Amino acid sequence: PSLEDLLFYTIAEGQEKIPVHKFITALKSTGLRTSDPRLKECMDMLRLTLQTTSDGVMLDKDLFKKCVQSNIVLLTQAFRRKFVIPDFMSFTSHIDELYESAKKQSGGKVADYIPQLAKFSPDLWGVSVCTVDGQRHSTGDTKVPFCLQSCVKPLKYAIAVNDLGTEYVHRYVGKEPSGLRFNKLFLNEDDKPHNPMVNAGAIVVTSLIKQGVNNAEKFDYVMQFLNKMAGNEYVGFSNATFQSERESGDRNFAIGYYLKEKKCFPEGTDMVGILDFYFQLCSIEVTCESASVMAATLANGGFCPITGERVLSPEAVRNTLSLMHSCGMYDFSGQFAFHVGLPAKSGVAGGILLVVPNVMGMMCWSPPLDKMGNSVKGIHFCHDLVSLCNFHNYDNLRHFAKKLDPRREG
Amino acid sequence: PSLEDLLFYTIAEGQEKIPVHKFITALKSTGLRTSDPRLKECMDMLRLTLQTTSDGVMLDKDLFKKCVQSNIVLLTQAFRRKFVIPDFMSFTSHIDELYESAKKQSGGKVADYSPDLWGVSVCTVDGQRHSTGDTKVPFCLQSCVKPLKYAIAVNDLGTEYVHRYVGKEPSGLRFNKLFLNEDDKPHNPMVNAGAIVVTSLIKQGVNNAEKFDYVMQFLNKMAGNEYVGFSNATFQSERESGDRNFAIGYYLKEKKCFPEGTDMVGILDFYFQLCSIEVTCESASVMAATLANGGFCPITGERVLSPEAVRNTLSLMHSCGMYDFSGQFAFHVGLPAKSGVAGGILLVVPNVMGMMCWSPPLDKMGNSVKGIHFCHDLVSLCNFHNYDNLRHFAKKLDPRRE
Amino acid sequence: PSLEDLLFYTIAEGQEKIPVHKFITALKSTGLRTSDPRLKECMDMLRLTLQTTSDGVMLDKDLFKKCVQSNIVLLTQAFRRKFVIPDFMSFTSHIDELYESAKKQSGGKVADYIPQLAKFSPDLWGVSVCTVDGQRHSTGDTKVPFCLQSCVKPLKYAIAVNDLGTEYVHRYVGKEPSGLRFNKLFLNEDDKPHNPMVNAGAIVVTSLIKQGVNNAEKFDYVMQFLNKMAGNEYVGFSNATFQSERESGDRNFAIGYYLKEKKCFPEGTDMVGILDFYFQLCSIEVTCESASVMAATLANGGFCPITGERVLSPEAVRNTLSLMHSCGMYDFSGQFAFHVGLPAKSGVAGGILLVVPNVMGMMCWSPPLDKMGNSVKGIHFCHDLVSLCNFHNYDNLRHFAKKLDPRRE
Amino acid sequence: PSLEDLLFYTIAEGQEKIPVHKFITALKSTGLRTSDPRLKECMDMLRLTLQTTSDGVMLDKDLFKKCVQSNIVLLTQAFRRKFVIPDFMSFTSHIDELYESAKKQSGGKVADYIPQLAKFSPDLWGVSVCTVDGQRHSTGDTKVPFCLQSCVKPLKYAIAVNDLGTEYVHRYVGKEPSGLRFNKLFLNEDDKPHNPMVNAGAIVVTSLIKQGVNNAEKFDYVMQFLNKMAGNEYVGFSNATFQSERESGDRNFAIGYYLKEKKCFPEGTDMVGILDFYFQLCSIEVTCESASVMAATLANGGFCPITGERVLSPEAVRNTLSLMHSCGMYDFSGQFAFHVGLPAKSGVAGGILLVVPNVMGMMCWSPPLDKMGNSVKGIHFCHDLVSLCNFHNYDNLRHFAKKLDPRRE
Ligand SMILES: O=C(Cc1ccccc1)Nc1nnc(OC2CN(c3nnc(NC(=O)Cc4ccccc4)s3)C2)s1
Ligand SMILES: O=C(Cc1ccccc1)Nc1nnc(OC2CN(c3nnc(NC(=O)Cc4ccccc4)s3)C2)s1
């Protein structure tokens, strides 16, 4: 036997040769993009042969084997329906219906407290999916950059835990939701911020990362980390959002001074500098597509699904998912945990970073926010998604009534 | 081909005939008990055969088929290693090590309002069973009954109705003192005020004796008809010592928290009865396993709770099940669990197993010292944490694998 | 000289004899009522003289001395303008204006959680004054009985402090207002109710009075005490209000069980009986007139101004006034202390028991309550009263701007 | 007759002439000091005379009249026992015993969070009295300057109410104590600081004074105001304390940014400059003697007793006294109101500014603080002071048991 040959026969369907377009089309139907970083050698060899061979455009068992040899494992998993969602085409058509249904929820108000948030249209709405196997889908405004804002909080907490361990980080920040009106206190009674997902907690976490080096390096370090989480897709920076965040951060300066007086930072912290670093981190830009890969990295135990690279330790990923479960959605976190049961994090630019553990990551984005600060369409989408699929953390994988399970076939 | 014969040959060893003891020994090794209610027909057929011919007592291909035909599917899944934990005996030896390690945590004080009793029982979603320690000693559910009666109410009345009367969130680590949240509902079903309201929703219109019978019948189904009892002694002491519960009851009454037509004073008495319901570790593990198994009881196959009832209960055990330790427990253990003052910890590993840990000595937060220690070790050892990853899990063992 | 004689000359006005009506009219103008218990011998002797002497109706120096001799000390202070408010007639005409101004404030809702409060007309409005010298004035519906309700809380706290002392009583109840939303908590962090003026605190205080004896005695004992505080004017009991208070007291039973579980009562307390005693104390009846005398006893350091009897210890009175100042007006207590600056206690029946220390006591009553549970007209009356007179706790007695001071001439 | 004449004879004792020293000793006997600003013309005349006739040094009726005539009203009133405390010498010996009793309470910890407070000896202890008539007494370390710190909060709140009125000022700050652990919150539910006596409230109040003008003038204005309040006795500034307060005021900066974001300041406020002004105000220095005069201005309805000058409106003084009663002693405020019943304000330097309305002002100073931030010796002195005298706000002026009343003879 031979695996490249075994693939060859499955796609050849009996003909002597496989047209290249027929291989490309079958590959995309699995959900992979041809630009997948794990498929580069196969795509390079295909492009090279379609130069050497303008006598084609067809691959015999020879030529096919030459192209797929270096990525044969992933291609076999792709073609033998071994991905976490085997019938990805059916699933993306469900994603699209959920998208269109959320598209009609027109309520909410865009964040307008700084000019670069009232700038974004209330009609932008995009959702991107990235499975733990790298299968991709996007519908709507998914290549429009927007700032992570508080969607960055779980990402930088994961970085802190990855670099420093659970015990160190939670010497400085708690691990629990505060309560439906302790949402207003900066500190719990151990004089720690309640958890990493609130502003006082995120400010302390920001103060833990890459200590001793300057802010430009700290930022480069977190940015390269975000690059790996996103499989090197778009991670950027909105200096416009940064200038306004630093001009409108009286509440954060109030938090910073409160934390300083209560001795909440690591020894030797320049609190005013940390606030500026914190302001920078909330102005980091993503698209729905690149952010979906970040969420998928968290869905995938800390491995980036489109590169195969280990980005975060399991401990960092587990802790981050645990705190997104209970603290990720502002005052809606309890209701969201109950009704959706998925680790998620919202931001004031309208993003919702969503993790379906072991299945996929998602970024939902629509700027108009509800009274709690969460994107109206994203929240609607996340309720619909769990209504349709047995993705709720406490759905059962065997008995799930009439929910669809996209991990199954028939 | 044929499934009974193929099963016969896998057990046959090539040999012509199967000793009956060899089949029992092979069956017990899968984790199933011979008393399993779903194997009743097969054990019935074996009992009849083990009279017919005692110069055997050997099952030829014909006679083996005679006994196993009506349970062949369940027996095949057991023998073809298809259960949720395939190498079940390896797993139970890990349970034993975990048990012995918690056995050395002697601290804590029994609720006094025995310190050397300690048992853990496992029931997987496929009905594989294991116990270590004092697992057939009855004890009262106390607050371990709160998720069970909440599931019953959601099962019979739906989420929307039940949560007109009770919230669905933890209160906060010093809002644990308030009976009502901001909408004048108790915070969640896992606190006493919430459980009192939930008690007032079950089987309205009938008297408390019927209500109790109905809850007992429901708990029987949850436990696949294993031990469910009632401790009148605990009931009397709970009711003579329930000043705080009367305080909660009167507070709820004044604040219009009960369904219209509620006799609050009677509900408190019903409530005292429910916390005095008795289980063992073994029967309670089946109850937990029903919650682990989407509401189907694993040793009978019966649909006991709606998926909605089970999901809601697991969600609220995640965040509210372990008193002031609920947040730390959700973070560090990541499993839906519920503790009780008699020393019980009802533990659910969704899609895998249910467990009851029982050890009366409680820590400062009211949770059984040994149980809490066991639950930390268990997730430290296996990738059972709610937010462990199933593919990349570092050095943890995954008992679902081979 | 002679005290009766010189007083005789002060009233005689050169005339040889004093008409009896001329003496009575001058006596009433000081603010005393002829029925004042400290004037009994003089009034009995006057009535007797108008029988023996239907050849009158005039009192010569001999006869005037015969009638006023045994109350000459009080009568001299009355007639020599020595009372705390010398020009009482002027003062009561201000009280009347204040009354009429508050009468036009028609807002508020009569308490209706029990039928005996809901029946009370929203248009009843009465204010009664009793000075620390026993001078009296009333305008409006001042002889209509109503239940003290929470106006009894400072009185029973005073009884407890009088009988048991500050230190003992405040082992069981604090001495501070709770804060603008610790009003829903039954206990402060030391597991005591915050102060005696909240329900939980009053229930605990109720549990301290005459421990060991049964409720009928306890009630008689407290009633004896209120009688003296009111100079034996009307103190009654509304059994109808008691039956309704006890059948609808879920929150008080919730408080009762919480306190028992937290061991807030003295050892040997029958908590459910204490709740029953507590409901009885809230159903005790007064009028504006009689309750004003109770307030005046508190205004007068524990002596009842119309009998001269010592009723409460100064320690009991100071403590009670201190806590009415800061905790007497429900959630309005801080605003009331700031703007009115007087020890006061409201109740759900519309009463406001009001104390101007060293000056007078008042009961204001009008059933309609505002959102905080305080009588709309009483609250309006009490603001106006301090706007007009330098009675605020922290008004100055020497420099008080445009305010009137009724203690001066 | 003649007022200078009668007075001369009362001091003359029938004798021919009054030696000047005998008049001075007699005057101090009333409690007034010879440096009293209202006695300047008389002391000027005495100084001129103590040159003319150094064959003396004695004043005949003519010469005495020459000296005392322009201060005759105050001098008679002093010499005829007409002051608020007639037997002032008796009173100061009670103060001395109270002083000596508190001197034996050596506990407490000197504030050390800035090096200017840790410099102060734990053994410094001073008490100064100034009555509403200007009678003066001091025992201990009463001319050692220390900073007001939070004792300034009532003074600047009084200024703000005096300049802007009650209604405007309390658009920005509440009028109530918060509760014993809403003490960690910066704002009440109306997004106002709870009261002017907490840091958040004092910071907002600072932002109201002389708006629109820069900080240097604002500070000058407050210093002139404090000068009037102290009858021009010692008011200074500790720049060292100011520098330390401002580099270590993280919680105050946290409060400032919180108030700014919640829009708690008047339109056009530079919050960071207000914090700087606020730190300056807490570094203003007094002695026990001068601060006692400021307290006496508050005891005297806004008139400074040693100058006769109107300094604050009665409204400003009433409000400040009201909020010192309930909010002036940090977490001890409720206990202090209950047990001492006097408006007071403590500060971290160990000062307690104490007001007995209509009677006297006091400054107590001893750096060692208790766990709540109040001076251990000051707190002890203030309890003893009211255990001894019927100065409690709700003591009765007529029936006060065995307490001493220094207003009586
Ligand atoms: O005092 C202590 C100890 C302590 C006291 C003070 C400081 C620290 C510690 N522990 C006590 N625990 N219970 C008490 O008596 C109650 C049973 N009570 C309920 N009252 N109100 C409820 N529901 C709402 O108010 C709605 C709501 C409004 C705002 C926020 C949240 C909810 S539930 C009060 S005292
Ligand atoms: O000290 C601790 C430790 C502790 C935690 C839990 C229990 C006990 C002890 N925790 C913190 N304490 N202060 C903090 O920084 C703040 C500046 N803050 C303000 N937040 N909110 C304000 N104003 C209103 O909310 C309106 C309002 C609404 C309802 C009631 C009262 C007021 S002012 C918080 S964190």
JSON list of N, CA, C and O and ligand atoms in Angstrom, two decimals, chain A residues 181-182 184-189 191 258, chain C residues 181, chain D residues 181-182 184-189 191 258, ligand 2:
[
{"chain": "A", "resi": 181, "resn": "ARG", "atom": "N", "xyz": [-23.82, 42.91, 42.04]},
{"chain": "A", "resi": 181, "resn": "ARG", "atom": "CA", "xyz": [-23.40, 44.26, 42.37]},
{"chain": "A", "resi": 181, "resn": "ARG", "atom": "C", "xyz": [-22.26, 44.19, 43.39]},
{"chain": "A", "resi": 181, "resn": "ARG", "atom": "O", "xyz": [-22.31, 44.77, 44.48]},
{"chain": "A", "resi": 182, "resn": "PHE", "atom": "N", "xyz": [-21.21, 43.45, 43.03]},
{"chain": "A", "resi": 182, "resn": "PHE", "atom": "CA", "xyz": [-19.83, 43.80, 43.33]},
{"chain": "A", "resi": 182, "resn": "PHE", "atom": "C", "xyz": [-19.10, 44.12, 42.03]},
{"chain": "A", "resi": 182, "resn": "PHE", "atom": "O", "xyz": [-17.87, 44.22, 42.01]},
{"chain": "A", "resi": 184, "resn": "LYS", "atom": "N", "xyz": [-18.99, 46.87, 40.77]},
{"chain": "A", "resi": 184, "resn": "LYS", "atom": "CA", "xyz": [-18.55, 48.23, 40.99]},
{"chain": "A", "resi": 184, "resn": "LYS", "atom": "C", "xyz": [-17.29, 48.36, 41.86]},
{"chain": "A", "resi": 184, "resn": "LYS", "atom": "O", "xyz": [-16.65, 49.42, 41.82]},
{"chain": "A", "resi": 185, "resn": "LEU", "atom": "N", "xyz": [-16.91, 47.32, 42.61]},
{"chain": "A", "resi": 185, "resn": "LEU", "atom": "CA", "xyz": [-15.70, 47.36, 43.43]},
{"chain": "A", "resi": 185, "resn": "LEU", "atom": "C", "xyz": [-14.46, 46.96, 42.62]},
{"chain": "A", "resi": 185, "resn": "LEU", "atom": "O", "xyz": [-14.53, 46.10, 41.74]},
{"chain": "A", "resi": 186, "resn": "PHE", "atom": "N", "xyz": [-13.32, 47.62, 42.90]},
{"chain": "A", "resi": 186, "resn": "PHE", "atom": "CA", "xyz": [-12.07, 47.29, 42.21]},
{"chain": "A", "resi": 186, "resn": "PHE", "atom": "C", "xyz": [-11.41, 46.06, 42.79]},
{"chain": "A", "resi": 186, "resn": "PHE", "atom": "O", "xyz": [-10.64, 45.38, 42.10]},
{"chain": "A", "resi": 187, "resn": "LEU", "atom": "N", "xyz": [-11.64, 45.79, 44.08]},
{"chain": "A", "resi": 187, "resn": "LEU", "atom": "CA", "xyz": [-10.95, 44.75, 44.82]},
{"chain": "A", "resi": 187, "resn": "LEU", "atom": "C", "xyz": [-11.95, 43.88, 45.57]},
{"chain": "A", "resi": 187, "resn": "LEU", "atom": "O", "xyz": [-13.00, 44.36, 46.00]},
{"chain": "A", "resi": 188, "resn": "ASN", "atom": "N", "xyz": [-11.64, 42.58, 45.69]},
{"chain": "A", "resi": 188, "resn": "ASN", "atom": "CA", "xyz": [-12.39, 41.72, 46.59]},
{"chain": "A", "resi": 188, "resn": "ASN", "atom": "C", "xyz": [-11.85, 41.93, 48.00]},
{"chain": "A", "resi": 188, "resn": "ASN", "atom": "O", "xyz": [-11.04, 42.84, 48.23]},
{"chain": "A", "resi": 189, "resn": "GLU", "atom": "N", "xyz": [-12.26, 41.13, 49.00]},
{"chain": "A", "resi": 189, "resn": "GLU", "atom": "CA", "xyz": [-11.68, 41.40, 50.33]},
{"chain": "A", "resi": 189, "resn": "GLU", "atom": "C", "xyz": [-10.27, 40.88, 50.56]},
{"chain": "A", "resi": 189, "resn": "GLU", "atom": "O", "xyz": [-9.71, 41.22, 51.61]},
{"chain": "A", "resi": 191, "resn": "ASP", "atom": "N", "xyz": [-8.11, 42.10, 48.83]},
{"chain": "A", "resi": 191, "resn": "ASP", "atom": "CA", "xyz": [-7.48, 43.27, 48.22]},
{"chain": "A", "resi": 191, "resn": "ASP", "atom": "C", "xyz": [-6.81, 42.92, 46.89]},
{"chain": "A", "resi": 191, "resn": "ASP", "atom": "O", "xyz": [-5.84, 43.55, 46.46]},
{"chain": "A", "resi": 258, "resn": "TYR", "atom": "N", "xyz": [-5.84, 53.47, 42.79]},
{"chain": "A", "resi": 258, "resn": "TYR", "atom": "CA", "xyz": [-6.38, 52.62, 43.85]},
{"chain": "A", "resi": 258, "resn": "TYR", "atom": "C", "xyz": [-5.53, 51.36, 44.03]},
{"chain": "A", "resi": 258, "resn": "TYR", "atom": "O", "xyz": [-5.26, 50.95, 45.17]},
{"chain": "C", "resi": 181, "resn": "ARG", "atom": "N", "xyz": [-28.06, 51.92, 52.44]},
{"chain": "C", "resi": 181, "resn": "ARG", "atom": "CA", "xyz": [-28.61, 50.61, 52.14]},
{"chain": "C", "resi": 181, "resn": "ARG", "atom": "C", "xyz": [-27.86, 49.52, 52.90]},
{"chain": "C", "resi": 181, "resn": "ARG", "atom": "O", "xyz": [-27.29, 48.59, 52.34]},
{"chain": "D", "resi": 181, "resn": "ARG", "atom": "N", "xyz": [-19.47, 50.05, 56.76]},
{"chain": "D", "resi": 181, "resn": "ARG", "atom": "CA", "xyz": [-18.66, 49.66, 55.61]},
{"chain": "D", "resi": 181, "resn": "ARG", "atom": "C", "xyz": [-19.45, 49.92, 54.33]},
{"chain": "D", "resi": 181, "resn": "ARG", "atom": "O", "xyz": [-19.58, 49.08, 53.45]},
{"chain": "D", "resi": 182, "resn": "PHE", "atom": "N", "xyz": [-19.92, 51.16, 54.24]},
{"chain": "D", "resi": 182, "resn": "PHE", "atom": "CA", "xyz": [-19.92, 51.91, 53.00]},
{"chain": "D", "resi": 182, "resn": "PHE", "atom": "C", "xyz": [-18.88, 53.02, 53.12]},
{"chain": "D", "resi": 182, "resn": "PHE", "atom": "O", "xyz": [-18.83, 53.93, 52.30]},
{"chain": "D", "resi": 184, "resn": "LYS", "atom": "N", "xyz": [-15.78, 52.56, 52.62]},
{"chain": "D", "resi": 184, "resn": "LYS", "atom": "CA", "xyz": [-14.78, 52.30, 51.58]},
{"chain": "D", "resi": 184, "resn": "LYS", "atom": "C", "xyz": [-15.22, 52.81, 50.22]},
{"chain": "D", "resi": 184, "resn": "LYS", "atom": "O", "xyz": [-14.40, 52.84, 49.30]},
{"chain": "D", "resi": 185, "resn": "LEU", "atom": "N", "xyz": [-16.49, 53.19, 50.07]},
{"chain": "D", "resi": 185, "resn": "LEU", "atom": "CA", "xyz": [-17.01, 53.74, 48.83]},
{"chain": "D", "resi": 185, "resn": "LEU", "atom": "C", "xyz": [-16.79, 55.25, 48.74]},
{"chain": "D", "resi": 185, "resn": "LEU", "atom": "O", "xyz": [-16.93, 55.97, 49.74]},
{"chain": "D", "resi": 186, "resn": "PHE", "atom": "N", "xyz": [-16.48, 55.71, 47.54]},
{"chain": "D", "resi": 186, "resn": "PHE", "atom": "CA", "xyz": [-16.25, 57.13, 47.30]},
{"chain": "D", "resi": 186, "resn": "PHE", "atom": "C", "xyz": [-17.55, 57.91, 47.15]},
{"chain": "D", "resi": 186, "resn": "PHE", "atom": "O", "xyz": [-17.61, 59.10, 47.51]},
{"chain": "D", "resi": 187, "resn": "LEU", "atom": "N", "xyz": [-18.59, 57.27, 46.62]},
{"chain": "D", "resi": 187, "resn": "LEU", "atom": "CA", "xyz": [-19.84, 57.95, 46.28]},
{"chain": "D", "resi": 187, "resn": "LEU", "atom": "C", "xyz": [-21.01, 57.19, 46.87]},
{"chain": "D", "resi": 187, "resn": "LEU", "atom": "O", "xyz": [-20.97, 55.96, 47.00]},
{"chain": "D", "resi": 188, "resn": "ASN", "atom": "N", "xyz": [-22.05, 57.93, 47.24]},
{"chain": "D", "resi": 188, "resn": "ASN", "atom": "CA", "xyz": [-23.32, 57.31, 47.61]},
{"chain": "D", "resi": 188, "resn": "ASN", "atom": "C", "xyz": [-24.08, 56.94, 46.34]},
{"chain": "D", "resi": 188, "resn": "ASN", "atom": "O", "xyz": [-23.52, 56.93, 45.24]},
{"chain": "D", "resi": 189, "resn": "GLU", "atom": "N", "xyz": [-25.37, 56.65, 46.46]},
{"chain": "D", "resi": 189, "resn": "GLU", "atom": "CA", "xyz": [-26.12, 56.18, 45.30]},
{"chain": "D", "resi": 189, "resn": "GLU", "atom": "C", "xyz": [-26.47, 57.31, 44.34]},
{"chain": "D", "resi": 189, "resn": "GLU", "atom": "O", "xyz": [-26.69, 57.05, 43.16]},
{"chain": "D", "resi": 191, "resn": "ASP", "atom": "N", "xyz": [-24.35, 59.42, 43.34]},
{"chain": "D", "resi": 191, "resn": "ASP", "atom": "CA", "xyz": [-23.08, 59.76, 42.72]},
{"chain": "D", "resi": 191, "resn": "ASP", "atom": "C", "xyz": [-22.47, 61.05, 43.28]},
{"chain": "D", "resi": 191, "resn": "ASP", "atom": "O", "xyz": [-21.67, 61.70, 42.62]},
{"chain": "D", "resi": 258, "resn": "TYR", "atom": "N", "xyz": [-11.67, 59.18, 40.12]},
{"chain": "D", "resi": 258, "resn": "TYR", "atom": "CA", "xyz": [-13.02, 58.62, 40.24]},
{"chain": "D", "resi": 258, "resn": "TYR", "atom": "C", "xyz": [-14.09, 59.72, 40.22]},
{"chain": "D", "resi": 258, "resn": "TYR", "atom": "O", "xyz": [-15.13, 59.57, 39.57]},
{"chain": "E", "resi": 2, "resn": "LIG", "atom": "O1", "xyz": [-12.63, 47.44, 49.97]},
{"chain": "E", "resi": 2, "resn": "LIG", "atom": "C1", "xyz": [-12.98, 46.47, 49.39]},
{"chain": "E", "resi": 2, "resn": "LIG", "atom": "C2", "xyz": [-12.91, 45.12, 50.11]},
{"chain": "E", "resi": 2, "resn": "LIG", "atom": "C3", "xyz": [-14.27, 44.53, 50.39]},
{"chain": "E", "resi": 2, "resn": "LIG", "atom": "C4", "xyz": [-14.98, 43.91, 49.37]},
{"chain": "E", "resi": 2, "resn": "LIG", "atom": "C5", "xyz": [-16.22, 43.34, 49.61]},
{"chain": "E", "resi": 2, "resn": "LIG", "atom": "C6", "xyz": [-16.77, 43.41, 50.88]},
{"chain": "E", "resi": 2, "resn": "LIG", "atom": "C7", "xyz": [-16.05, 44.04, 51.90]},
{"chain": "E", "resi": 2, "resn": "LIG", "atom": "C8", "xyz": [-14.80, 44.60, 51.67]},
{"chain": "E", "resi": 2, "resn": "LIG", "atom": "N1", "xyz": [-13.45, 46.59, 48.03]},
{"chain": "E", "resi": 2, "resn": "LIG", "atom": "C9", "xyz": [-13.42, 47.93, 47.47]},
{"chain": "E", "resi": 2, "resn": "LIG", "atom": "N2", "xyz": [-13.76, 49.08, 48.05]},
{"chain": "E", "resi": 2, "resn": "LIG", "atom": "N3", "xyz": [-13.61, 50.19, 47.26]},
{"chain": "E", "resi": 2, "resn": "LIG", "atom": "C10", "xyz": [-13.13, 50.02, 46.03]},
{"chain": "E", "resi": 2, "resn": "LIG", "atom": "O2", "xyz": [-12.86, 51.03, 45.09]},
{"chain": "E", "resi": 2, "resn": "LIG", "atom": "C11", "xyz": [-13.99, 51.75, 44.95]},
{"chain": "E", "resi": 2, "resn": "LIG", "atom": "C12", "xyz": [-14.33, 53.17, 44.77]},
{"chain": "E", "resi": 2, "resn": "LIG", "atom": "N4", "xyz": [-15.70, 52.62, 44.77]},
{"chain": "E", "resi": 2, "resn": "LIG", "atom": "C13", "xyz": [-17.09, 53.01, 44.69]},
{"chain": "E", "resi": 2, "resn": "LIG", "atom": "N5", "xyz": [-17.91, 52.17, 44.15]},
{"chain": "E", "resi": 2, "resn": "LIG", "atom": "N6", "xyz": [-19.20, 52.58, 44.21]},
{"chain": "E", "resi": 2, "resn": "LIG", "atom": "C14", "xyz": [-19.43, 53.78, 44.70]},
{"chain": "E", "resi": 2, "resn": "LIG", "atom": "N7", "xyz": [-20.76, 54.39, 44.81]},
{"chain": "E", "resi": 2, "resn": "LIG", "atom": "C15", "xyz": [-21.87, 53.54, 44.50]},
{"chain": "E", "resi": 2, "resn": "LIG", "atom": "O3", "xyz": [-21.68, 52.42, 44.18]},
{"chain": "E", "resi": 2, "resn": "LIG", "atom": "C16", "xyz": [-23.34, 53.93, 44.60]},
{"chain": "E", "resi": 2, "resn": "LIG", "atom": "C17", "xyz": [-23.92, 52.98, 45.64]},
{"chain": "E", "resi": 2, "resn": "LIG", "atom": "C18", "xyz": [-24.82, 51.98, 45.31]},
{"chain": "E", "resi": 2, "resn": "LIG", "atom": "C19", "xyz": [-25.31, 51.14, 46.31]},
{"chain": "E", "resi": 2, "resn": "LIG", "atom": "C20", "xyz": [-24.92, 51.28, 47.62]},
{"chain": "E", "resi": 2, "resn": "LIG", "atom": "C21", "xyz": [-24.01, 52.27, 47.95]},
{"chain": "E", "resi": 2, "resn": "LIG", "atom": "C22", "xyz": [-23.51, 53.11, 46.96]},
{"chain": "E", "resi": 2, "resn": "LIG", "atom": "S1", "xyz": [-17.94, 54.37, 45.25]},
{"chain": "E", "resi": 2, "resn": "LIG", "atom": "C23", "xyz": [-15.29, 51.21, 44.96]},
{"chain": "E", "resi": 2, "resn": "LIG", "atom": "S2", "xyz": [-12.89, 48.32, 45.89]}
]
